[PDB]
Design a binder for this molecule. Structure first.
Ligand SMILES: *[C@@H]1O[C@H](CO)[C@@H](O[C@@H]2O[C@H](CO)[C@@H](O)[C@H](O)[C@H]2NC(C)=O)[C@H](O)[C@H]1NC(C)=O
Lengths: 53, 49
């Protein structure tokens, strides 16, 4: 209109959510509980010698 | 230089380059990358170069 140009109003997103990126250390000692559980049950068997004889 | 000064082991190096890259990109997202005037406006050789 005349010399000036008119532009439409811009709609705005109401909310934003922040989810930052985190470094991944990738440690291996955690989630190894099964090995500890296996260590718990060694179960060495010893039979008395001389009771039979 | 930072990796050599410390004793990074080819897996914490990637954890350092990621941080450096993200920080530098965040800085670079708001800078316009222009050139500093130093000579004379009339001269044509500098502009041609
Ligand atoms: C939290 O634990 C999850 C599951 O172990 C990790 O997600 C894995 O990440 C690796 C590396 O990117 C991928 O290869 C796997 O496919 C992912 N698994 C799943 C189920 O998503 C996640 O990385 C851990 N978070 C941190 C910060 O270490």
């Amino acid at each position: 209109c005349f010399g000036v140009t008119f532009k439409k109003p811009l709609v705005a997103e109401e909310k934003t959510s922040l989810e930052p990126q985190l470094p991944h250390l990738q440690l291996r000692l955690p989630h190894l509980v099964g090995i500890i559980a296996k260590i718990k049950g060694i179960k060495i068997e010893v039979t008395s010698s001389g009771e039979s004889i | 230089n930072v990796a050599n000064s410390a004793n990074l082991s080819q897996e914490t190096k990637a954890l350092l380059t990621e941080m450096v890259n993200e920080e530098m990109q965040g800085l670079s997202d708001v800078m316009i990358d222009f050139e500093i005037p130093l000579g004379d406006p009339r001269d044509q050789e500098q502009y041609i170069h």
